[model samples]
Target: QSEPELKLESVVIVSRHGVRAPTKATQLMQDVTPDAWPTWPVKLGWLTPRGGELIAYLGHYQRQRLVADGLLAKKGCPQSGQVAIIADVDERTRKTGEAFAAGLAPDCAITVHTQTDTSSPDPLFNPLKTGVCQLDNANVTDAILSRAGGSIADFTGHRQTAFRELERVLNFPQSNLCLKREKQDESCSLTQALPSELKVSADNVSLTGAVSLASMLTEIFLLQQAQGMPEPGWGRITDSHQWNTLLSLHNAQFYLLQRTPEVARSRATPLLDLIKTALTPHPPQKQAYGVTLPTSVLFIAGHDTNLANLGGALELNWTLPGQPDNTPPGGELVFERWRRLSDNSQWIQVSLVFQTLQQMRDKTPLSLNTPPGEVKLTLAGCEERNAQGMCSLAGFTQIVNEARIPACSL
Candidate 1:
């Protein structure tokens, strides 16, 4: 059942940029597999035209839902003052913001706010890189180990079948980059330890091994599928189940890298603070992230890493319908504040909203009858919840506050 006369207040969406060409370093990728990697329509790592279109679809859906909530008019363009969008320095991110605005407002004039220098990092998004925070190597390793049940080597055993299947697709037995190296090297086998170490240099904390490399490889395959390429994984990847199997590698890497509690707290602090201010009635900063208070909608076009960090901080877990990865391209972590008229109580409902893999591949247009994948989140410490899975605004504040490392914020 619906809540008792709840009025929609505002929303904040932290979204990952849409599907793009495989990131730079295709040579490294090509080395792992025998086949010549297919070329992409756009430059390496930049958002493709399809990527922009996909994000626009997500924006259109958000607009339709908000209209249903009585936040905007029935037909025409929304007032100029109603919405705000901010993005990171990447051209993909900035363009993704404009794509969403196009879908959300259709044809009215809208602008995306971004930093002045594309070369410089936005401290709001890259706290570690901007020298706003530091991570101890030992602590990073410990946290990652804790998440992996104390032994990452043992953790790889859980996905052994996945590894074997990926090797089969790569034709690793006949040809592998490792074969060029001495057999003593662990990377000689797709299932073996790869450069065995949990690296944490210059805020570049990552597990250096088969799983890490596999994460990049499998993501390329997924992107290829999303891009509607001629033959995804050279037609070796047979079906959806296989797609999910390989994507497990992608998820596993993030599980260790970005989603560990310590890493999450360090990387997600500034973004979390931004979310807090957006949901508040009167934000202290006149234009917090280039938006005034009580904004109808605010969107931050970012990366999957950002969402994974927030997922870790909030202890969120969900496998969206028709999608394997927990954090998919163009998906978002959404926070909506609502007021109940019966007692004037304020509550917040957090959700994950994204396109299903089928919809993402097919470019399906969403409506009330056929909506995007959205599941209300259950906060780790917030016990009381309604049928709608909404927690009190105080609970949302408490949850986010506890996860914050105040020293690392913007």
Candidate 2:
């Protein structure tokens, strides 16, 4: 059977901001590692120049693909209302949006919209601010401890073994707090209480210092790789196997914190509503700023949590080239709309796309295929797919609307 021709109509991209320094340095970090932690050239939590370049390359690749698919002009400026770029209030996210805009449309002046307070988190990106509660902190705690091994006692033993491995890889001494602690202590406690215990009303379990240690080390190695620095004098701590293990543990922490279905629903609804509004042929009146309907392309730059929560809400199950869709830096969840030429029926395809480990380490330019990878996602409850694996636009929207209404009321 001959396939009907399809034409691209619109695109909505939700992307994680590129790499940055750790948001803050914990006292445990200071006590656990040797003095070799690489100091980032950028301010804490701000995007590095290398990260900006990587995102810019991603934007350029997006332009190429969009032009190839006929969603954009081959070589011309975009109309004012055709494109929209919005980002969270954080400096890294806003800068990432601008970098992408510059790459996607060099000649045009694409305004990047952001909230007035840069420090305050936008509700669209920060689900913790949404005022909904029901996340079982104990469940997260159980998941973390159980994933490490059995119970907290067993996990404590397992953590010691893992710390030994990390110490050997990083060439750190046994005197380091991460390695020295046999019993829980102020500096490195494996039995920390939940965030709720501290009266913080966020949907996060209290993670042990061991988790933080592993996560911080992984981030350091990743940052070094991204910056083109040689492995630390101790050894290459970021070999594929070790990196994957550490990353898995890091992802597990967040998976429990944010990827729980209830938490994901609370966090993802606003963002999903915005995307639905953009995709709807006849959207409702704009209730928010700069969120008009019917755009050729829409860019939303947010955090890794947003990606993970959205994936959870949609019940997405897919693996990227190097990792699962646990939200690697600069990863994008793209929703592309297409229209069948013969009958003008529309369909939507969703993809979880991101750079490979090699690409991130080398700052390589992303292509549609090649170093960059994509996983076609099927929206849960909307299983009907055409030859190209796209669901009918109405089917997809119906699923989203069902999810959105309950979420908004909460």
Best candidate (score: TM-score) = 1
**Model 1 lDDT per residue over 1-410, tens place:** 86548888889999998898888664556666777788898988899988889899888888888889988776888886688899998988998999999988888778888877779999888689888988777878788888788887778878888888888788775565756756654445675625445777556687776877888888988898877787888899888889899999999999888988888887999988888878977743446555676677889999989999999988887788788777888899998998878787888888999888888788787766778899778887897655567888888888889999888887
How do all models score by TM-score?
A: 0.94, 0.84
* lDDT of residue 290 for candidate 1: 56
Candidate 2 lDDT over residue span 12-118, tens digit each: 99999987776776666555555556666888899988888888878888888888887788787787677789999988999899888888888688988887677
lDDT of each: 0.83, 0.70
Best by lDDT: 1
Report the CA-based lDDT of candidate 2 relative to the real structure.
0.70
Clashing residue pairs in candidate 2 (N, C-alpha, C atoms within 3 angstroms): none
Give the Å shift of residue 138 in candidate 2. 7.9
Model 1, TM vs. native: 0.94
